[PDB]
Amino acid sequence: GKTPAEFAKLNECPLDPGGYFIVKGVEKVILIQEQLSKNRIIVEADRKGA
Amino acid sequence: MLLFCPGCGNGLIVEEGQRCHRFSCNTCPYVHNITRKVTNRKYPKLKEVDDVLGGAAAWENVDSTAESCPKCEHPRAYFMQLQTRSADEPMTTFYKCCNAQCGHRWR
Amino acid sequence: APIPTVEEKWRLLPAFLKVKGLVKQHIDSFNYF
Amino acid sequence: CRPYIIVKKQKPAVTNKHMEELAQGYRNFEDFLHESLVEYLDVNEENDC
Amino acid sequence: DDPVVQEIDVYLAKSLAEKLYLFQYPVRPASMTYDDIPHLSAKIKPKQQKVELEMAIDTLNPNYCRSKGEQIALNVDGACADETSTYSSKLMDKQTFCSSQTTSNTSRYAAALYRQGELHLTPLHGILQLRPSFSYLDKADAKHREREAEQARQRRVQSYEFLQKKHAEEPWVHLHYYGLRDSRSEHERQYLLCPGSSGVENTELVKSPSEYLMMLMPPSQEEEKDKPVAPSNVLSMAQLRTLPLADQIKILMKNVKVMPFANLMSLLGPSIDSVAVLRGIQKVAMLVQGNWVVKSDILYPKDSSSPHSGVPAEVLCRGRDFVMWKFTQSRWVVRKEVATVTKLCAEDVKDFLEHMAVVRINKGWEFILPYDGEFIKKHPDVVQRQHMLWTGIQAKLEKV
Numbered sequence: 001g002k003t004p005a006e007f008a009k010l011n012e013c014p015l016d017p018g019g020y021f022i023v024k025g026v027e028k029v030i031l032i033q034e035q036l037s038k039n040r041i042i043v044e045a046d047r048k049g050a
Numbered sequence: 051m052l053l054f055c056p057g058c059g060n061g062l063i064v065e066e067g068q069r070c071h072r073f074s075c076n077t078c079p080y081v082h083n084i085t086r087k088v089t090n091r092k093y094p095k096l097k098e099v100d101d102v103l104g105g106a107a108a109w110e111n112v113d114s115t116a117e118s119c120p121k122c123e124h125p126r127a128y129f130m131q132l133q134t135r136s137a138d139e140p141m142t143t144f145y146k147c148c149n150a151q152c153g154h155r156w157r
Numbered sequence: 158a159p160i161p162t163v164e165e166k167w168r169l170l171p172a173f174l175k176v177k178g179l180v181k182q183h184i185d186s187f188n189y190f
Numbered sequence: 191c192r193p194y195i196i197v198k199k200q201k202p203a204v205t206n207k208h209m210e211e212l213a214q215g216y217r218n219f220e221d222f223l224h225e226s227l228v229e230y231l232d233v234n235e236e237n238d239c
Numbered sequence: 240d241d242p243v244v245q246e247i248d249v250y251l252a253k254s255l256a257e258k259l260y261l262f263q264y265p266v267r268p269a270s271m272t273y274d275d276i277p278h279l280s281a282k283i284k285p286k287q288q289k290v291e292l293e294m295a296i297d298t299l300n301p302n303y304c305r306s307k308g309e310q311i312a313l314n315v316d317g318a319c320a321d322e323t324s325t326y327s328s329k330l331m332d333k334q335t336f337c338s339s340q341t342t343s344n345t346s347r348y349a350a351a352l353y354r355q356g357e358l359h360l361t362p363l364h365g366i367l368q369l370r371p372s373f374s375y376l377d378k379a380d381a382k383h384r385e386r387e388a389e390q391a392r393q394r395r396v397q398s399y400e401f402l403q404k405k406h407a408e409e410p411w412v413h414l415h416y417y418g419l420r421d422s423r424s425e426h427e428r429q430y431l432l433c434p435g436s437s438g439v440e441n442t443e444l445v446k447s448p449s450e451y452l453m454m455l456m457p458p459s460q461e462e463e464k465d466k467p468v469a470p471s472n473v474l475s476m477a478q479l480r481t482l483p484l485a486d487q488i489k490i491l492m493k494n495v496k497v498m499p500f501a502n503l504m505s506l507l508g509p510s511i512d513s514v515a516v517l518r519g520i521q522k523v524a525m526l527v528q529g530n531w532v533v534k535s536d537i538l539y540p541k542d543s544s545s546p547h548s549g550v551p552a553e554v555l556c557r558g559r560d561f562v563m564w565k566f567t568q569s570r571w572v573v574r575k576e577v578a579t580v581t582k583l584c585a586e587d588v589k590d591f592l593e594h595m596a597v598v599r600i601n602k603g604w605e606f607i608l609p610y611d612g613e614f615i616k617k618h619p620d621v622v623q624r625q626h627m628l629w630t631g632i633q634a635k636l637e638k639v
């Protein structure tokens with residue numbers, strides 16, 4: 001909620017995207033993961049073809 | 051095709067223990083002795099007969115008429131047809147020519 | 158006949174970007190948490 | 191998800207008057223959502239569109 | 240689509256509301272009914288409704304394998320005990336059925352009896368599903384086996400034998416039976432037809448469709464944890480009932496900067512008094528060239544500062560009032576250099592011009608929207624009020 005005028009006092013860039021953490025001085029980003037849905041019927045052909 | 055006992059609702063079996071065979075359950079004493087015909091089956095299964103006549107087997111199948119190729123037409127390939135899978139599916143035909151060093155054979 | 162074209166459809170995109178869109182997923186998820 | 195403009199009987203739901211209103215500031219995006227002018231679509235649902 | 244035929248009426252019979260049951264046999268074709276075979280015994284429990292129905296079986300008929308039946312009876316019943324036997328003879332004389340409940344609540348199901356020109360409805364007391372039971376094999380197995388030979392936290396609630404014991408608590412009830420062939424069935428059938436006048440205006444069913452939709456789609460949230468202060472933009476086209484009209488005008492003039500009078504009655508709608516809104520408007524706007532513009536202080540509260548990425552400064556509305564007075568004095572302001580008069584940075588001047596003016600090439604800035612017939616609305620008095628109020632504000636502003 002700060003305006004750029006106040007951003008200037010904190011030594012931050014108004015254009016900065018944010019959304020990361022600062023831990024011991026380094027900026028860390030928790031990336032988006034990807035995975036299959038649960039509770040779904042899957043029909044699959046075995047390595048033997050069954 | 052399958053039958054179920056009306057008395058208890060289970061698959062029945064055929065057995066003989068008297069003058070005539072009978073359709074019988076096994077958890078309830080229901081018996082229905084068979085006395086007429088039925089006209090349907092489970093469609094049995096035996097594998098691909100390919101080389102039982104391979105090569106030049108019994109020459110009783112010599113035939114006269116044959117088709118011809120659209121390109122070359124030397125005197126040696128009389129006609130043929132065969133079948134695909136089972137009782138109630140279509141029957142395929144291929145027309146194949148062979149002298150040497152190619153891979154021609156039509157469908 | 159030429160079906161008439163809404164020339165300003167694209168103006169919806171800046172409107173959408175004002176509340177959602179870029180980098181807002183991380184912040185919304187953390188806020189909910 | 192993705193937003194799309196709804197179409198009925200070969201005319202888009204949105205109209206130049208809505209765009210003029212949005213430019214002037216009378217309405218915002220969520221107004222388009224509530225008046226059934228646009229809607230989100232998921233991968234599974236847009237299989238049927 | 241006009242009506243064609245058979246505008247049949249419907250009536251509700253409460254005679255058997257707690258007395259009707261619906262049995263069904265998933266394993267039996269509907270063409271093979273049970274009425275032919277005599278029934279012998281039945282049991283029921285009132286709570287957790289379940290039944291045990293005992294069915295006689297023909298033995299004289301040839302399809303009964305007598306040898307197999309004797310073997311089964313020997314396997315299940317004592318060789319010569321016969322004191323408490325599942326069957327009286329040395330062959331099975333009966334087979335048993337057991338019931339399974341389908342759904343806990345049956346309020347939305349009803350049994351309808353058709354009749355010429357009329358339908359008679361009745362609520363069901365329950366629905367049950369009947370299957371043949373194979374427990375005699377278990378009894379035979381048990382007989383074969385008997386012939387062969389600071390406590391921790393309780394978790395007995397979830398155990399099956401708990402429920403078995405709880406069901407066993409309920410005492411059994413024995414029932415008499417009458418088949419469909421008995422005239423007793425037809426006699427009892429009379430109770431479905433509820434008596435009364437054919438045409439009656441029901442006292443209930445007063446809810447209009449809006450109330451019905453409200454009733455069967457209850458609001459998702461009974462009470463919200465926060466109040467809609469709405470400092471930022473919110474749903475606008477819906478005139479929120481919780482939002483008083485004065486604040487409606489406030490937020491609307493905060494969103495759109497300059498706006499003629501007509502669009503106000505266009506947006507609020509004709510339901511609101513057109514005279515009362517004048518009050519809010521004069522608290523929140525003034526006629527430049529016959530069109531309202533929002534105060535500077537509404538956009539610039541006294542506790543704020545220049546938010547734009549140019550030069551921070553103390554909140555100075557006076558520049559906005561100055562350019563606004565210039566717009567009142569002339570149709571369009573040629574002065575690029577308003578900064579020379581009011582001493583802000585050029586970017587602030589351009590921002591101030593942006594809200595209410597548009598650029599014309601080599602011709603300065605022009606008021607964004609044109610003049611109007613301000614006298615059509617019969618308030619020249621408020622026009623004069625604004626006029627000498629602006630005379631006073633100009634006198635104040637002339638100090639700098």
Ligand SMILES: [Zn+2]
Nearest residue numbers: 058060075077
């Ligand atoms: Zn059986």
